[PDB]
Scaffold this motif. Structure first.
Motif, PDB file in Angstrom:
ATOM      1  N   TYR A  66      42.549  38.218  28.313  1.00 57.15           N
ATOM      2  CA  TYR A  66      42.943  39.319  29.175  1.00 57.15           C
ATOM      3  C   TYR A  66      44.006  40.082  28.915  1.00 57.15           C
ATOM      4  CZ  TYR A  66      44.329  41.816  33.575  1.00 57.15           C
ATOM      5  OH  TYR A  66      44.822  42.505  34.285  1.00 57.15           O
ATOM      6  N   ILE A  67      44.982  39.402  28.484  1.00 57.72           N
ATOM      7  CA  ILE A  67      46.323  40.351  27.973  1.00 57.72           C
ATOM      8  C   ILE A  67      46.140  41.192  26.747  1.00 57.72           C
ATOM      9  CG2 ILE A  67      48.756  40.093  27.198  1.00 57.72           C
ATOM     10  CD1 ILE A  67      48.439  39.586  30.407  1.00 57.72           C
ATOM     11  N   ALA A  68      45.197  40.391  25.850  1.00 53.63           N
ATOM     12  CA  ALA A  68      45.116  41.444  24.737  1.00 53.63           C
ATOM     13  C   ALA A  68      44.256  42.454  25.008  1.00 53.63           C
ATOM     14  CB  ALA A  68      44.251  40.244  23.573  1.00 53.63           C
ATOM     15  N   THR A  69      43.556  42.476  26.088  1.00 55.44           N
ATOM     16  CA  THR A  69      42.708  43.642  26.178  1.00 55.44           C
ATOM     17  C   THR A  69      43.520  44.544  27.267  1.00 55.44           C
ATOM     18  OG1 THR A  69      40.527  42.436  26.367  1.00 55.44           O
ATOM     19  CG2 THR A  69      40.620  44.360  27.675  1.00 55.44           C
ATOM     20  N   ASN A  70      44.326  44.184  28.203  1.00 53.37           N
ATOM     21  CA  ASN A  70      44.818  44.824  29.199  1.00 53.37           C
ATOM     22  C   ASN A  70      46.265  45.080  29.143  1.00 53.37           C
ATOM     23  OD1 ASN A  70      41.957  42.964  30.787  1.00 53.37           O
ATOM     24  ND2 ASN A  70      42.090  45.274  31.075  1.00 53.37           N
ATOM     25  N   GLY A  71      46.930  44.083  28.642  1.00 53.54           N
ATOM     26  CA  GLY A  71      48.476  44.234  28.516  1.00 53.54           C
ATOM     27  C   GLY A  71      48.931  43.702  29.705  1.00 53.54           C
ATOM     28  N   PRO A  72      50.305  43.433  29.848  1.00 53.29           N
ATOM     29  CA  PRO A  72      50.918  42.726  30.889  1.00 53.29           C
ATOM     30  C   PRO A  72      50.646  43.060  32.353  1.00 53.29           C
ATOM     31  CG  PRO A  72      52.399  43.837  29.651  1.00 53.29           C
ATOM     32  CD  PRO A  72      51.217  43.974  28.932  1.00 53.29           C
ATOM     33  N   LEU A  73      50.741  42.225  33.147  1.00 54.66           N
ATOM     34  CA  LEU A  73      50.720  42.518  34.616  1.00 54.66           C
ATOM     35  C   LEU A  73      51.995  43.159  34.845  1.00 54.66           C
ATOM     36  CD1 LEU A  73      48.788  39.600  36.547  1.00 54.66           C
ATOM     37  CD2 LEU A  73      48.047  41.556  35.698  1.00 54.66           C
ATOM     38  N   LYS A  74      52.083  43.780  36.213  1.00 52.19           N
ATOM     39  CA  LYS A  74      53.301  44.276  36.930  1.00 52.19           C
ATOM     40  C   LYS A  74      53.941  42.969  37.683  1.00 52.19           C
ATOM     41  CE  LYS A  74      51.504  49.003  37.492  1.00 52.19           C
ATOM     42  NZ  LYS A  74      50.898  49.809  38.225  1.00 52.19           N
ATOM     43  N   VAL A  75      55.154  42.986  37.782  1.00 47.06           N
ATOM     44  CA  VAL A  75      55.748  42.201  38.702  1.00 47.06           C
ATOM     45  C   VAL A  75      55.289  42.575  40.110  1.00 47.06           C
ATOM     46  CG1 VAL A  75      58.093  41.121  39.837  1.00 47.06           C
ATOM     47  CG2 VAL A  75      57.623  41.861  37.208  1.00 47.06           C
ATOM     48  N   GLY A  76      54.792  42.021  41.169  1.00 47.79           N
ATOM     49  CA  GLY A  76      54.234  42.212  42.233  1.00 47.79           C
ATOM     50  C   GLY A  76      52.774  42.547  42.062  1.00 47.79           C
ATOM     51  N   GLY A  77      52.316  42.377  41.022  1.00 49.01           N
ATOM     52  CA  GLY A  77      50.666  42.563  40.610  1.00 49.01           C
ATOM     53  C   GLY A  77      49.954  41.354  40.536  1.00 49.01           C
ATOM     54  N   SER A  78      48.628  41.659  40.424  1.00 46.05           N
ATOM     55  CA  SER A  78      47.640  40.271  40.125  1.00 46.05           C
ATOM     56  C   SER A  78      46.441  40.905  39.333  1.00 46.05           C
ATOM     57  CB  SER A  78      47.182  40.022  41.664  1.00 46.05           C
ATOM     58  OG  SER A  78      46.314  40.859  42.117  1.00 46.05           O
ATOM     59  N   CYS A  79      45.672  39.754  38.934  1.00 49.86           N
ATOM     60  CA  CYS A  79      44.346  39.882  38.529  1.00 49.86           C
ATOM     61  C   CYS A  79      43.586  38.713  38.828  1.00 49.86           C
ATOM     62  CB  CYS A  79      44.434  40.084  37.128  1.00 49.86           C
ATOM     63  SG  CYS A  79      44.646  38.505  36.019  1.00 49.86           S
ATOM     64  N   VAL A  80      42.191  38.950  39.055  1.00 46.74           N
ATOM     65  CA  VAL A  80      41.212  38.008  39.298  1.00 46.74           C
ATOM     66  C   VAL A  80      40.557  37.490  37.998  1.00 46.74           C
ATOM     67  CG1 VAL A  80      39.197  37.265  40.730  1.00 46.74           C
ATOM     68  CG2 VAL A  80      40.908  38.997  41.578  1.00 46.74           C
ATOM     69  N   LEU A  81      40.677  36.207  37.857  1.00 45.78           N
ATOM     70  CA  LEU A  81      40.030  35.694  36.658  1.00 45.78           C
ATOM     71  C   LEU A  81      39.242  34.301  37.155  1.00 45.78           C
ATOM     72  CD1 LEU A  81      42.775  35.798  34.041  1.00 45.78           C
ATOM     73  CD2 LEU A  81      40.673  37.190  34.076  1.00 45.78           C
ATOM     74  N   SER A  82      38.574  33.669  36.234  1.00 48.73           N
ATOM     75  CA  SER A  82      37.718  32.444  36.524  1.00 48.73           C
ATOM     76  C   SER A  82      38.775  31.421  37.348  1.00 48.73           C
ATOM     77  CB  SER A  82      36.979  31.927  35.535  1.00 48.73           C
ATOM     78  OG  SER A  82      36.421  30.722  35.871  1.00 48.73           O
ATOM     79  N   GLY A  83      38.042  30.681  38.221  1.00 45.26           N
ATOM     80  CA  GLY A  83      38.919  29.586  38.655  1.00 45.26           C
ATOM     81  C   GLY A  83      38.465  28.186  37.940  1.00 45.26           C
ATOM     82  N   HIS A  84      37.748  28.280  37.050  1.00 45.78           N
ATOM     83  CA  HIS A  84      37.133  27.265  36.208  1.00 45.78           C
ATOM     84  C   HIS A  84      36.744  25.952  36.856  1.00 45.78           C
ATOM     85  CE1 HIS A  84      38.695  29.522  32.724  1.00 45.78           C
ATOM     86  NE2 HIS A  84      39.612  29.892  33.270  1.00 45.78           N
ATOM     87  N   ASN A  85      37.042  24.735  36.562  1.00 48.11           N
ATOM     88  CA  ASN A  85      36.716  23.534  37.461  1.00 48.11           C
ATOM     89  C   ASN A  85      37.510  23.388  38.724  1.00 48.11           C
ATOM     90  OD1 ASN A  85      39.036  23.300  35.626  1.00 48.11           O
ATOM     91  ND2 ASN A  85      39.053  21.159  36.139  1.00 48.11           N
ATOM     92  N   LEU A  86      38.429  24.355  39.083  1.00 50.90           N
ATOM     93  CA  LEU A  86      39.267  24.168  40.381  1.00 50.90           C
ATOM     94  C   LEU A  86      38.990  25.072  41.429  1.00 50.90           C
ATOM     95  CD1 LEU A  86      42.806  24.398  38.499  1.00 50.90           C
ATOM     96  CD2 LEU A  86      41.361  22.049  39.077  1.00 50.90           C
TER      97      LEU A  86
END
Ligand SMILES: CC[C@H](CNC(=O)CCC1CCCCC1)Nc1ncnc2[nH]ncc12
Length: 167
Positions: A66-86
């Protein structure tokens, strides 16, 4: 009706439990678990390191792509990724890290990300190793999040304190 058990109801929409978020996630398998992320999605410790360890490092592998494609998040920001086994999904949310000098006003912006999801299992943002006062974090949560949030607090002593001091 949902599958969360043993929570104390704080408000119309906020609930709190003394629980390990990893174990709670493993049992409930919620639609959304919130990670206490940093902008680089480097899941080294705290909640993030625990969640990542429980995924056998798959969370970190996905995050690095995700970071290699999009760069860092912002402080205060978010992204949705997989929850894997959780969980179905993991909402990676960046609260300000007081141990990095970040502005605590950004904590409200961080919690606003929760409003994009009807129900979430979450830690208190900016608590723990992020250095904020968990009582302040709980107040901001209650005053910002309008969707249904189930907060897992690992430390039993902290939990008792948060409940007893809640206004
Ligand atoms: C994202 C921050 C929260 C803060 N809340 C805590 O309870 C941390 C324990 C002490 C809190 C009081 C002294 C410092 C550590 N951290 C977690 N929240 C749920 N589950 C977790 N697992 N590992 C960390 C963590």
């Amino acid at each position: 009706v949902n599958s969360f058990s043993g929570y104390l109801k704080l408000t119309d929409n906020v609930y709190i439990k003394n629980a390990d978020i990893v174990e709670e996630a493993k049992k409930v398998k919620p639609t959304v678990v919130v990670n206490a992320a940093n902008v680089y999605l480097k899941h080294g410790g705290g909640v993030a390191g625990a969640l990542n360890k429980a995924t056998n490092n798959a969370m970190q592998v996905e995050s690095d792509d995700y970071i290699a494609t999009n760069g860092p998040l912002k402080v205060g920001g978010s992204c949705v990724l997989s929850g894997h086994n959780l969980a179905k999904h993991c909402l990676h949310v960046v609260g300000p890290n007081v141990n990095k000098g970040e502005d605590i006003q950004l904590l409200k912006s961080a919690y606003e990300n929760f409003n994009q999801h009807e129900v979430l299992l979450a830690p208190l943002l900016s608590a723990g190793i992020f250095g904020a006062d968990p009582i302040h974090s709980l107040r901001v949560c209650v005053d910002t999040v309008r969707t249904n949030v189930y907060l897992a607090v690992f430390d039993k002593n902290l939990y008792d304190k948060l409940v007893s001091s809640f206004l």
